[PDB]
Amino acid sequence: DKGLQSLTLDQSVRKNEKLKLAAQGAEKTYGNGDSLNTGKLKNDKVSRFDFIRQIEVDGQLITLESGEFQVYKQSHSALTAFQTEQIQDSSGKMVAKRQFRIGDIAGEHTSFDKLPEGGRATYRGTAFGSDDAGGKLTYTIDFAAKQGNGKIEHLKSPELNVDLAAADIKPDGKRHAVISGSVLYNQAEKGSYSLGIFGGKAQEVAGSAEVKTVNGIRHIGLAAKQL
Amino acid sequence: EIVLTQSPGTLSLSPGERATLSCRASQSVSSSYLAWYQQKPGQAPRLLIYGTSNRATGIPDRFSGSGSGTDFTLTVSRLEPEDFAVYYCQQYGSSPCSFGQGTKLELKRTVAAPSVFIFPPSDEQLKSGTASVVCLLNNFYPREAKVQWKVDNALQSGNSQESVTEQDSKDSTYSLSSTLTLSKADYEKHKVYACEVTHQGLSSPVTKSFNRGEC
Amino acid sequence: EVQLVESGGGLVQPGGSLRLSCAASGFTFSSYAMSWVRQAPGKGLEWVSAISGSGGSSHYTDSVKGRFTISRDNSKNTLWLQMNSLRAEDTAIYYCAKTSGSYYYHYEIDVWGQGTTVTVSSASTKGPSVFPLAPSTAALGCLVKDYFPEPVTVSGVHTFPAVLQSSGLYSLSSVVTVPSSSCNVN
Ligand SMILES: [Cl-]
Ligand SMILES: [Cl-]
């Protein structure tokens, strides 16, 4: 019933892979390019599915990965993410392994050449990583300078509550407005972040951060909107 | 809703023989989603083989699995006594998950004849208004046996219930009870009570009898 | 070690209700789908229901779709089966089962519980009237007749499975061979 009504699955399911999602008594199967109906999902929240990924090998369907599939939906943007629970060993055998990654980031991308030529926007939204959807993203874009900066707060893991350093709005090869910059924790480079700008009026940002931690690189999905 | 049909339903084999258990699906099942479970009596099932050919943690090399499409096989190259149990194939690649009806692996041994005994009803039971007459067939192989009840030489029908033990852990024999249930009235109006047992270990049928009130 | 302990089974009447519990230990509970599988007396294994590791997806054999509700508590390592509107055929041993992965299917049951017995009938708890089976190399025994739900205890020796009598009560005999010149029940 509400937008974003539809997300193309592209990163989330690769060609000839099969992605099954389950929630309650429903189960749906998806292949590369297929549409996920985000129209019925709650805006401004993480929607939860169980997933399994399969492929044919030597004529038999096998499992590649199982776990939880997360969707954060906004009005003009959404993003998917995977919490793996089991993954192919290396050998035709699953092994337990928990890792988190961002899947598709999509929506009505704002054109770089049609951005607001002036003014300041403040975006407020959610940062979510492994086992933690409770983080809070604040981000600010100065369209006069075409710089953005922000930060993540309230994630349970304190090393994840980083600053998103000032970075430029540039066009990518589709002429979409995107931001790529650095992440700081306590005044130290601790990774990077990426945001696209979405909505005809730059109403939303959505992307991800990769944060250096003692436990390895940790991924954070990012989405926010203006009032 | 795939249907798995296991054949044979019962398989009687000697230790040290090779066992071939068969599981046939109503449609193709991926090798990745077929398993075998073993269940011994009074015990929960145990995972044996997963993904058609993968032995589980603690399962001997003796056990092996193979198959693809609609036809799967479990093999016990050389049967230890511990392997005589019920085996179940299960498909878990489609919903609902399904298990076949099981194949019971029986421990074959040399014929043993039943030691037949008969028991009249106790007098306490001739007070509740019912009389039970028990015929016991003790320590016998194979399980195949017929028990006929006769009251004053009249062959009885529908008034008897049988119960058979699991194959013994040591002798590999079976024991069976046959219980005639008659009214205290019918019991007090008839004299000869007899249970006739036929068994491969016996050249002719064994009859045990009592006369009510005598002995 | 990896352990699955069922509780909550027992005797109800038709239409009644039981809440199976299964206490998981020895593994990371939330990472694995769990299932209930049942076994009617003397019959095969029948898959009942399964629930994903996260608790977000569930499925049931059509037999219990609408009547049974699976759930879990990943904070307390507990699996549940709520059985409402129980029926005669639902009588069985119910096994808790751990599968080898998070998705509610595509993983085998790698661990089974001990089983919790469920009985659905009108019969009322009664007790065993133990008669002698006196001897005529000999044979002697006891007739444990007309007794509560299963089971009964009896301490060469052959204790026979119970038979459900046309009445609805159970009956068995325990026999013991002993030398010619020569019933710890309940
Ligand atoms: Cl779904
Ligand atoms: Cl007749």
XYZ file of C-alpha atoms and ligand atoms in Angstrom:
630
model
C 0.000 0.000 0.000
C 2.892 2.605 0.692
C 6.092 3.415 -1.351
C 8.935 2.423 -1.969
C 6.654 -0.172 -3.620
C 9.322 -2.387 -5.282
C 13.098 -3.147 -4.999
C 15.032 -4.930 -7.666
C 17.030 -7.800 -6.266
C 20.435 -7.690 -7.992
C 23.153 -7.780 -5.339
C 20.963 -9.906 -3.049
C 20.614 -12.769 -5.613
C 23.231 -13.435 -8.333
C 22.464 -15.027 -11.679
C 21.253 -18.668 -11.471
C 21.212 -18.480 -7.709
C 17.819 -19.027 -6.076
C 16.829 -16.938 -3.068
C 13.956 -18.070 -0.908
C 12.472 -15.794 1.735
C 10.123 -16.975 4.476
C 7.988 -14.984 6.903
C 5.162 -16.569 8.927
C 3.461 -19.105 6.584
C 4.657 -17.367 3.430
C 7.614 -18.395 1.326
C 8.678 -16.685 -1.879
C 11.378 -17.500 -4.395
C 13.459 -14.909 -6.239
C 16.101 -14.900 -8.955
C 18.482 -12.128 -10.088
C 16.559 -9.031 -11.284
C 13.282 -10.186 -9.752
C 11.184 -7.573 -7.699
C 10.751 -7.712 -3.862
C 7.286 -6.138 -3.001
C 8.348 -3.600 -0.231
C 4.941 -1.882 -0.619
C 3.329 -3.892 2.239
C 6.343 -3.569 4.648
C 6.412 -1.027 7.593
C 8.138 2.273 6.612
C 11.131 3.342 8.829
C 11.644 -0.136 10.287
C 13.648 -3.286 9.709
C 11.465 -6.027 8.084
C 12.583 -9.567 8.845
C 12.621 -12.697 6.672
C 14.365 -16.054 6.875
C 16.325 -16.906 3.799
C 18.096 -19.742 2.057
C 20.258 -19.459 -1.081
C 20.610 -22.411 -3.467
C 22.268 -23.164 -6.813
C 22.421 -26.155 -9.186
C 25.774 -27.985 -9.342
C 26.387 -31.135 -11.411
C 22.612 -31.339 -11.875
C 21.555 -31.156 -8.186
C 20.286 -28.166 -6.200
C 22.587 -27.509 -3.220
C 22.533 -24.899 -0.365
C 25.012 -21.974 -0.431
C 23.809 -19.963 2.581
C 20.978 -19.655 5.116
C 20.057 -17.105 7.757
C 18.057 -13.856 8.128
C 17.209 -11.261 5.478
C 16.480 -7.685 6.551
C 14.833 -4.861 4.582
C 14.768 -1.256 5.709
C 12.142 0.661 3.763
C 11.776 4.416 3.269
C 9.441 6.307 0.944
C 11.930 6.690 -1.963
C 14.673 4.253 -0.877
C 15.212 0.892 0.724
C 18.080 -1.457 1.440
C 18.515 -5.137 2.072
C 20.938 -6.923 4.300
C 21.917 -10.530 5.143
C 22.718 -12.115 8.480
C 24.320 -15.431 7.543
C 23.974 -18.355 9.927
C 25.437 -21.234 7.807
C 27.626 -20.924 4.622
C 29.244 -23.521 2.305
C 32.394 -24.840 4.107
C 35.066 -23.705 1.591
C 33.248 -29.456 -0.161
C 29.456 -29.877 -0.372
C 28.991 -29.178 3.332
C 27.644 -26.286 5.391
C 29.428 -24.739 8.365
C 28.229 -22.339 11.002
C 29.401 -18.801 10.442
C 27.783 -15.526 11.408
C 28.508 -12.576 9.212
C 26.587 -9.517 8.161
C 26.582 -7.649 4.888
C 24.585 -5.075 2.989
C 22.677 -6.334 -0.024
C 20.868 -4.006 -2.401
C 20.615 -0.245 -1.907
C 17.895 1.082 -4.168
C 15.152 3.559 -4.773
C 14.253 6.680 -6.863
C 17.882 7.961 -7.048
C 18.075 11.815 -7.044
C 19.822 13.207 -10.153
C 23.091 14.972 -9.395
C 22.309 17.680 -11.964
C 18.860 18.267 -10.329
C 19.996 18.530 -6.663
C 18.976 21.578 -4.550
C 21.416 24.285 -5.608
C 21.272 25.800 -2.034
C 20.245 25.238 1.592
C 20.954 22.730 4.343
C 19.111 19.469 4.889
C 19.171 17.409 8.132
C 18.335 13.653 7.655
C 17.373 11.462 10.681
C 17.094 7.711 10.505
C 18.497 4.332 11.389
C 21.868 2.597 11.499
C 21.694 -1.190 11.760
C 24.324 -3.889 11.918
C 24.589 -7.475 13.010
C 22.028 -8.240 15.763
C 21.432 -4.479 16.242
C 18.728 -2.432 14.496
C 18.619 0.223 17.235
C 21.235 2.661 15.986
C 20.449 6.226 15.050
C 21.833 8.034 12.017
C 21.951 11.804 11.784
C 23.284 13.286 8.572
C 23.449 16.830 7.211
C 23.900 17.937 3.605
C 24.948 21.519 2.756
C 23.775 21.747 -0.831
C 25.552 25.088 -1.224
C 28.895 23.339 -0.651
C 27.686 19.867 -1.747
C 29.227 18.368 1.352
C 27.604 15.992 3.790
C 28.556 14.728 7.205
C 26.909 12.838 9.958
C 27.093 10.266 12.536
C 25.943 7.012 14.064
C 24.827 6.737 17.671
C 23.392 4.208 20.130
C 24.544 0.972 18.533
C 25.206 -1.607 21.254
C 28.800 -2.014 20.113
C 30.444 1.314 21.032
C 33.161 1.063 18.321
C 30.321 1.328 15.750
C 29.044 4.763 16.901
C 31.307 6.548 14.489
C 31.433 9.927 12.705
C 30.737 10.081 8.977
C 33.334 12.606 7.845
C 32.710 15.540 5.525
C 32.671 14.265 1.966
C 31.622 15.545 -1.442
C 28.483 14.879 -3.393
C 29.651 13.546 -6.755
C 27.874 11.994 -9.750
C 28.359 8.305 -10.480
C 28.183 6.799 -13.986
C 24.372 6.956 -13.973
C 24.423 10.699 -13.087
C 23.096 9.919 -9.603
C 24.139 11.902 -6.548
C 26.284 9.814 -4.202
C 28.589 10.489 -1.249
C 31.719 8.446 -0.484
C 33.762 9.372 2.550
C 35.666 8.391 5.624
C 34.649 7.140 9.016
C 36.213 8.458 12.221
C 36.074 7.100 15.783
C 37.734 9.256 18.445
C 39.593 11.271 15.697
C 41.074 8.176 13.909
C 40.347 6.802 10.407
C 38.225 3.665 11.144
C 36.817 2.835 7.695
C 34.480 4.428 5.144
C 30.861 5.093 4.283
C 28.739 5.492 1.146
C 25.379 7.185 0.711
C 23.143 7.760 -2.240
C 20.623 10.598 -2.214
C 17.024 9.656 -3.095
C 13.726 11.314 -3.980
C 13.070 14.070 -6.535
C 13.682 16.625 -3.660
C 16.720 14.850 -2.013
C 14.321 13.732 0.739
C 16.381 10.698 1.728
C 19.824 9.139 2.050
C 20.610 5.423 2.092
C 23.832 3.523 2.080
C 26.294 1.692 4.236
C 29.456 2.032 6.338
C 32.413 -0.397 6.781
C 33.989 0.171 10.249
C 37.418 -1.162 11.355
C 37.138 -3.003 14.659
C 39.327 -5.352 16.724
C 37.001 -8.178 15.546
C 37.380 -7.335 11.847
C 35.442 -5.136 9.422
C 31.836 -4.584 10.445
C 29.062 -3.459 8.159
C 26.311 -0.979 8.967
C 23.239 -0.253 6.862
C 22.243 3.393 6.802
C 18.969 5.162 5.912
C 17.528 8.500 6.886
C 14.963 11.076 5.770
C 14.156 14.778 6.140
C 11.013 15.868 8.101
C 3.965 -33.783 0.130
C 6.426 -36.186 -1.513
C 5.733 -39.840 -0.621
C 8.698 -42.015 0.320
C 8.117 -45.781 -0.021
C 10.645 -48.022 1.698
C 11.121 -51.599 0.527
C 11.201 -54.284 1.846
C 9.049 -53.572 4.895
C 10.903 -56.209 6.906
C 14.321 -57.610 6.044
C 15.662 -60.659 7.879
C 19.443 -61.092 7.538
C 22.303 -62.763 9.441
C 25.098 -60.799 11.107
C 28.002 -60.307 8.678
C 25.712 -60.197 5.647
C 25.261 -57.133 3.430
C 22.059 -55.121 3.866
C 20.485 -53.041 1.080
C 17.642 -50.772 2.233
C 15.658 -49.026 -0.498
C 13.765 -45.646 -0.415
C 11.710 -44.620 -3.503
C 10.340 -41.065 -3.797
C 7.081 -40.141 -5.616
C 9.133 -37.409 -7.439
C 12.856 -36.516 -7.752
C 14.523 -35.438 -4.448
C 17.932 -33.686 -4.482
C 20.760 -35.733 -2.966
C 21.402 -32.708 -0.677
C 17.976 -33.217 0.982
C 17.722 -36.957 1.809
C 18.733 -38.575 5.123
C 18.488 -41.940 6.918
C 17.595 -42.366 10.614
C 17.993 -45.463 12.807
C 15.572 -46.228 15.658
C 16.021 -49.060 18.162
C 12.980 -50.030 20.279
C 12.288 -47.779 23.289
C 14.763 -45.260 21.858
C 14.427 -42.011 19.926
C 15.542 -42.009 16.316
C 19.220 -41.145 15.522
C 20.620 -39.438 12.395
C 22.636 -41.953 10.306
C 23.282 -40.446 6.795
C 22.576 -36.841 5.640
C 22.690 -35.473 2.093
C 22.354 -39.017 0.607
C 26.015 -40.108 1.331
C 27.382 -38.169 4.359
C 27.845 -40.152 7.613
C 26.908 -38.224 10.780
C 29.129 -37.712 13.855
C 29.659 -41.214 15.374
C 28.332 -43.460 12.534
C 30.640 -46.269 11.310
C 32.108 -46.611 7.789
C 30.088 -49.878 7.615
C 27.061 -47.609 6.891
C 27.044 -45.981 3.437
C 24.367 -44.220 1.377
C 23.826 -43.546 -2.337
C 21.099 -42.514 -4.760
C 19.623 -39.717 -6.864
C 16.284 -38.979 -8.531
C 13.443 -41.133 -7.159
C 15.637 -44.011 -5.829
C 17.991 -44.045 -2.776
C 19.838 -46.866 -0.968
C 21.410 -47.385 2.524
C 24.119 -50.143 2.743
C 25.450 -51.900 5.920
C 28.381 -53.876 4.248
C 28.775 -56.235 7.297
C 25.885 -56.149 9.892
C 26.899 -55.921 13.575
C 24.218 -57.067 16.058
C 23.743 -53.386 17.080
C 22.451 -52.580 13.517
C 19.248 -54.712 13.824
C 16.717 -51.809 14.209
C 14.166 -49.770 12.152
C 15.614 -47.451 9.460
C 13.689 -44.416 8.127
C 14.527 -42.339 5.027
C 13.309 -38.692 5.173
C 13.197 -35.993 2.430
C 13.707 -32.386 3.660
C 14.045 -30.565 0.351
C 10.338 -29.840 -0.048
C 7.479 -28.951 2.298
C 5.869 -30.758 4.091
C 8.991 -32.791 5.135
C 8.226 -36.558 4.830
C 9.444 -39.768 6.206
C 8.976 -43.225 4.603
C 7.189 -45.938 6.653
C 10.398 -47.624 7.829
C 12.273 -50.912 7.140
C 12.719 -53.217 10.165
C 16.129 -55.145 10.057
C 15.529 -58.462 11.906
C 18.441 -60.618 13.311
C 18.097 -64.025 11.612
C 19.031 -67.084 13.677
C 18.337 -70.910 13.812
C 14.723 -72.159 14.391
C 13.809 -72.424 18.146
C 10.454 -74.046 19.192
C 8.040 -72.350 21.526
C 7.830 -73.726 25.081
C 3.993 -73.541 25.279
C 2.219 -72.943 28.633
C -1.408 -72.331 29.616
C -2.800 -70.481 32.660
C -6.362 -70.702 34.029
C -8.005 -67.626 35.524
C -7.403 -66.808 39.167
C -10.322 -66.873 41.589
C -10.041 -63.100 42.364
C -10.843 -62.419 38.681
C -13.817 -64.881 38.962
C -15.314 -62.054 41.183
C -14.971 -58.972 38.880
C -17.231 -61.114 36.598
C -14.628 -61.750 33.883
C -12.173 -64.612 33.361
C -8.898 -64.310 31.435
C -7.128 -67.391 30.105
C -3.513 -66.913 29.034
C -1.457 -69.022 26.602
C 2.276 -68.239 26.632
C 4.657 -69.152 23.761
C 8.227 -68.678 25.337
C 11.673 -67.974 23.634
C 10.950 -68.967 19.943
C 12.413 -68.055 16.478
C 11.019 -67.183 13.868
C 8.192 -64.738 14.984
C 5.698 -66.622 12.783
C 3.329 -68.681 15.048
C -0.430 -69.512 15.086
C -2.350 -69.855 18.420
C -5.939 -71.256 18.327
C -8.245 -71.258 21.395
C -10.710 -74.151 21.959
C -13.350 -74.337 24.754
C -14.931 -77.839 24.976
C -13.325 -78.423 21.494
C -15.207 -75.391 19.998
C -12.703 -73.195 18.040
C -12.926 -69.640 19.405
C -12.954 -66.449 17.232
C -12.819 -62.698 18.148
C -12.403 -63.224 21.953
C -8.544 -63.422 22.038
C -5.780 -60.745 21.844
C -2.072 -61.399 21.192
C 1.040 -59.458 22.334
C 4.597 -60.252 21.079
C 7.914 -59.137 22.596
C 10.742 -57.441 20.640
C 13.525 -59.785 19.453
C 15.613 -60.638 22.571
C 18.994 -58.853 23.023
C 20.733 -62.242 23.643
C 18.772 -65.223 22.164
C 17.223 -63.133 19.340
C 14.004 -65.117 20.077
C 10.403 -63.746 20.443
C 7.805 -64.490 23.200
C 4.008 -64.139 22.586
C 0.953 -64.073 24.905
C -2.547 -64.982 23.680
C -5.279 -63.837 26.133
C -8.786 -65.405 25.842
C -11.376 -63.122 27.513
C -14.704 -64.740 28.399
C -17.462 -63.975 30.949
C -17.298 -65.656 34.368
C -20.633 -67.207 33.295
C -19.211 -68.803 30.105
C -16.112 -69.840 32.080
C -18.202 -71.688 34.739
C -20.378 -73.460 32.044
C -17.443 -75.102 30.144
C -14.785 -77.666 31.255
C -11.853 -78.084 28.779
C -9.772 -74.969 27.884
C -7.017 -75.452 25.286
C -4.432 -73.330 23.345
C -3.001 -75.085 20.171
C 0.357 -73.680 18.979
C 1.849 -74.208 15.497
C 5.594 -73.312 15.063
C 8.268 -74.232 12.442
C 10.318 -75.660 15.346
C 7.556 -78.260 15.906
C 6.822 -81.319 13.762
C 3.175 -81.199 14.834
C 1.017 -78.664 16.710
C 1.461 -78.460 20.484
C -1.681 -78.278 22.626
C -1.762 -77.233 26.294
C -5.029 -77.653 28.198
C -6.596 -77.576 31.590
C -9.896 -78.853 33.024
C -11.695 -76.163 35.048
C -11.535 -76.985 38.781
C -9.362 -80.109 38.326
C -5.545 -79.969 39.129
C 26.451 -31.641 25.532
C 23.807 -30.974 22.763
C 20.662 -31.921 24.719
C 16.960 -31.590 24.049
C 14.607 -32.219 26.987
C 10.855 -32.430 26.261
C 8.262 -31.893 28.993
C 4.553 -31.106 29.156
C 3.078 -34.261 27.718
C 0.409 -36.205 29.492
C -3.165 -37.345 29.318
C -6.010 -35.085 28.134
C -9.517 -35.797 26.747
C -10.686 -34.992 23.170
C -10.915 -31.206 22.613
C -8.316 -30.661 25.396
C -4.962 -28.839 25.354
C -1.264 -29.477 26.219
C 1.764 -27.151 26.001
C 4.870 -29.148 25.049
C 8.127 -27.590 26.147
C 11.642 -28.567 24.860
C 14.739 -27.187 26.959
C 17.748 -26.869 24.539
C 21.345 -26.952 25.788
C 24.809 -27.313 24.268
C 24.524 -25.296 21.102
C 23.732 -21.818 19.847
C 19.971 -22.205 19.924
C 19.020 -19.278 17.703
C 21.173 -20.451 14.818
C 19.076 -23.609 14.131
C 15.583 -24.370 12.975
C 13.765 -26.704 15.375
C 10.917 -29.157 14.729
C 8.472 -31.475 16.421
C 8.137 -35.004 15.071
C 5.703 -37.560 16.387
C 5.305 -41.332 16.482
C 1.912 -42.944 17.017
C 2.070 -46.279 18.854
C 3.615 -48.912 16.607
C 3.668 -46.635 13.536
C 6.273 -44.565 11.734
C 7.686 -41.100 12.220
C 5.430 -38.231 11.176
C 6.725 -34.694 10.757
C 4.512 -32.248 12.682
C 5.914 -28.713 12.549
C 9.047 -26.610 12.218
C 10.153 -23.075 13.010
C 13.200 -21.172 11.746
C 16.196 -20.303 13.944
C 15.043 -16.614 14.203
C 11.413 -17.598 14.962
C 10.183 -15.615 11.943
C 8.839 -18.470 9.748
C 6.812 -21.604 10.677
C 5.077 -24.483 8.817
C 2.828 -27.416 9.810
C 1.487 -30.731 8.398
C -2.118 -29.896 7.256
C -3.357 -32.415 9.974
C -2.529 -29.776 12.681
C -2.634 -26.500 10.567
C -5.043 -24.297 12.736
C -4.879 -26.544 15.859
C -1.116 -26.529 16.741
C 1.155 -23.435 17.295
C 4.988 -23.787 17.338
C 7.092 -21.008 18.971
C 10.428 -20.486 20.689
C 12.310 -18.258 23.137
C 15.893 -17.652 21.858
C 16.643 -15.809 25.191
C 15.726 -18.909 27.273
C 16.730 -21.712 24.856
C 13.167 -23.054 24.780
C 10.948 -24.528 22.054
C 7.198 -24.879 22.500
C 4.324 -26.702 20.831
C 0.863 -25.448 21.835
C -1.626 -28.233 21.112
C -5.210 -27.015 21.177
C -8.294 -29.033 20.283
C -6.485 -32.357 20.682
C -7.963 -35.422 18.953
C -7.674 -39.187 19.228
C -5.131 -39.515 16.395
C -2.782 -36.917 17.964
C -1.853 -39.574 20.556
C 1.869 -40.254 20.189
C 5.375 -39.785 21.471
C 6.432 -36.249 20.443
C 10.127 -35.666 19.792
C 11.823 -32.293 19.865
C 14.288 -32.114 16.988
C 17.217 -29.853 16.188
C 18.044 -29.423 12.518
C 21.525 -28.647 11.149
C 20.679 -25.098 9.991
C 18.578 -21.914 10.353
C 16.030 -22.379 7.531
C 12.802 -24.236 8.522
C 13.587 -26.916 5.806
C 16.638 -28.041 3.698
C 18.373 -29.184 6.925
C 18.323 -32.741 8.442
C 17.442 -33.428 12.083
C 20.930 -33.932 13.609
C 19.744 -34.219 17.297
C 16.554 -35.826 18.741
C 15.053 -35.478 22.203
C 13.985 -38.405 24.443
C 10.304 -37.925 23.607
C 7.269 -36.789 25.697
C 4.151 -38.996 25.523
C 0.767 -37.497 24.689
C -2.459 -39.447 25.185
C -5.893 -38.200 24.088
C -8.826 -40.302 25.355
C -11.852 -40.465 27.740
C -10.366 -43.275 29.906
C -9.679 -42.194 33.529
C -6.624 -43.047 35.617
C -7.404 -46.522 37.130
C -4.816 -48.919 38.619
C -3.321 -52.356 38.004
C -5.119 -55.448 39.558
C -2.221 -58.002 39.432
C -3.403 -61.706 39.141
C -1.230 -64.721 39.408
C -0.248 -66.921 36.495
C 0.780 -69.891 38.633
C 2.711 -72.927 37.365
C 0.917 -76.148 36.509
C 11.667 -75.987 33.485
C 8.345 -74.384 34.506
C 6.575 -70.973 33.795
C 4.813 -68.485 36.123
C 3.803 -64.840 35.651
C 1.359 -61.924 36.495
C -1.720 -60.494 34.608
C -1.472 -56.676 35.013
C -5.063 -56.019 33.844
C -7.250 -52.879 33.464
C -4.639 -50.132 34.200
C -4.214 -46.274 34.021
C -2.530 -44.860 30.894
C 0.832 -46.404 30.015
C 3.299 -47.352 31.445
C 3.509 -50.002 34.239
C 6.711 -51.510 35.768
C 7.339 -55.248 36.422
C 10.650 -56.552 38.039
C 14.206 -65.489 31.220
C 11.720 -62.691 32.062
C 9.396 -61.412 29.275
C 7.155 -58.365 30.071
C 4.701 -58.101 27.149
C 3.718 -54.866 25.433
C 0.337 -53.528 26.643
C -2.773 -54.193 24.474
C -5.580 -51.600 24.355
C -8.659 -53.716 25.243
C -12.021 -53.090 23.436
C -12.844 -51.279 26.712
C -10.089 -48.606 26.354
C -8.100 -49.814 29.343
C -4.658 -51.453 28.828
C -3.617 -54.978 29.896
C -0.319 -56.914 29.901
C 1.276 -59.997 31.402
C 4.813 -60.350 32.794
C 6.013 -64.002 32.622
C 9.168 -65.557 34.129
C 10.530 -69.082 33.563
C 12.095 -70.540 36.779
C 13.341 -74.134 37.646
C 10.569 -76.820 37.895
C 11.492 -77.871 41.467
C 12.304 -74.354 42.853
C 5.756 -59.597 39.889
C 7.495 -56.488 41.318
C 4.845 -54.405 39.513
C 2.795 -51.355 40.651
Cl 8.003 -14.411 2.169
Cl -17.684 -68.361 17.216
